[PDB]
Amino acid sequence: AQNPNCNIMIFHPTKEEFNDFDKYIAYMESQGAHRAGLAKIIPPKEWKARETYDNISEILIATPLQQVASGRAGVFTQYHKKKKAMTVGEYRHLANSKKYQTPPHQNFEDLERKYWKNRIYNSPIYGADISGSLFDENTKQWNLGHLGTIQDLLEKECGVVIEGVNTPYLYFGMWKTTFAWHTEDMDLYSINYLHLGEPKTWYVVPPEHGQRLERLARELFPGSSRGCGAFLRHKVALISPTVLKENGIPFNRITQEAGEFMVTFPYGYHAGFNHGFNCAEAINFATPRWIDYGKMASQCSCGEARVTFSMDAFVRILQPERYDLWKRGQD
Numbered sequence: 001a002q003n004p005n006c007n008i009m010i011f012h013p014t015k016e017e018f019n020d021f022d023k024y025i026a027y028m029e030s031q032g033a034h035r036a037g038l039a040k041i042i043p044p045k046e047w048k049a050r051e052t053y054d055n056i057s058e059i060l061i062a063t064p065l066q067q068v069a070s071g072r073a074g075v076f077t078q079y080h081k082k083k084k085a086m087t088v089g090e091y092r093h094l095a096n097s098k099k100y101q102t103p104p105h106q107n108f109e110d111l112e113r114k115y116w117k118n119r120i121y122n123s124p125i126y127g128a129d130i131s132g133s134l135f136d137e138n139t140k141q142w143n144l145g146h147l148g149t150i151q152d153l154l155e156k157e158c159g160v161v162i163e164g165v166n167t168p169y170l171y172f173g174m175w176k177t178t179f180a181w182h183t184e185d186m187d188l189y190s191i192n193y194l195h196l197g198e199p200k201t202w203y204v205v206p207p208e209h210g211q212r213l214e215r216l217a218r219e220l221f222p223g224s225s226r227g228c229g230a231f232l233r234h235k236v237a238l239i240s241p242t243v244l245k246e247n248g249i250p251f252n253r254i255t256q257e258a259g260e261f262m263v264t265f266p267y268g269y270h271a272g273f274n275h276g277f278n279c280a281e282a283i284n285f286a287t288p289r290w291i292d293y294g295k296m297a298s299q300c301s302c303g304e305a306r307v308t309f310s311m312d313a314f315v316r317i318l319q320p321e322r323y324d325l326w327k328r329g330q331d
């Protein structure tokens with residue numbers, strides 16, 4: 001078995017190897033990359049996403065989210081308080097202000113220490129989940145707006161045509177902005193490109209050990225767990241690396257820098273934080289190997305998780321027994 005310790009793997013495809021996206025994912029999996037739940041892909045030196053980032057300041061962040069924490073430094077939840085609209089240029093200025101800017105630090109490990117010590121005492125503002133793309137239309141390789149759609153993949157594998165569309169999302173971050181522990185909708189893959197700015201640190205649990213994280217989460221968030229049998233789908237719970245190690249949960253960590261891709265694999269729980277002002281693009285995708293994960297994915301039916309239009313058909317076709325309950329949760 002390749003990669004039996006479930007380490008995060010880093011790949012350096014050549015320009016030739018960068019042509020065929022699906023082929024390269026399958027190659028990474030042949031080397032055991034999926035066992036980690038997360039891989040890094042450094043693009044060939046000949047590649048670029050677009051020419052410059054000089055003209056992005058007028059993008060609108062219609063609903064910036066202030067991420068308010070509750071709990072203790074290593075075990076907390078966050079809620080999202082909606083703020084007034086602002087442009088990317090306004091948000092960048094806010095991220096760089098004394099109130100929000102990254103503190104002085106020695107290296108990524110020192111900043112990580114500071115994050116986990118102090119995150120809860122601040123409420124950073126996250127420009128998350130903005131439909132759109134920063135890839136140039138002329139970028140032919142690894143262009144996250146030109147991937148094969150998940151509806152086409154399901155149709156190809158299973159023979160059933162379904163409604164729905166699959167488009168990317170932009171994330172404008174600042175110091176301490178946080179993504180809570182989660183797997184993707186329907187335990188899909190994700191791919192994330194860090195277009196510009198400061199790094200993003202990731203934590204990940206191997207898919208074969210995801211249920212160990214779920215059991216810890218139920219213990220640590222006992223009210224949330226009574227409320228919903230899949231409450232990590234709410235995307236509000238944080239647990240630090242120190243707490244995971246104390247509880248024997250297998251995990252890994254890595255820092256993504258501008259110009260790098262990350263891929264999350266089906267049922268790979270992940271969480272993390274941004275170092276300072278940045279902009280990432282991400283989208284979900286599927287392969288043949290995903291179908292079995294999609295058929296077994298948990299679902300939230302309590303009402304909280306509320307998701308896109310396109311998840312309806314995935315539940316309907318892959319999980320017909322669960323469909324009626326899940327849809328009630330949507331309504």
Ligand SMILES: O=C(O)CNC(=O)C(=O)O
Binds near residue numbers: 171179190
């Ligand atoms: O960048 C973020 O805030 C969150 N991203 C992801 O969870 C992802 O790309 O799968």
Ligand SMILES: [Mg+2]
Binds near residue numbers: 058059
């Ligand atoms: Mg602009």
Ligand code: NI
Binds near residue numbers: 184
């Ligand atoms: Ni994700």
Ligand SMILES: [Zn+2]
Binds near residue numbers: 230231
């Ligand atoms: Zn729920």
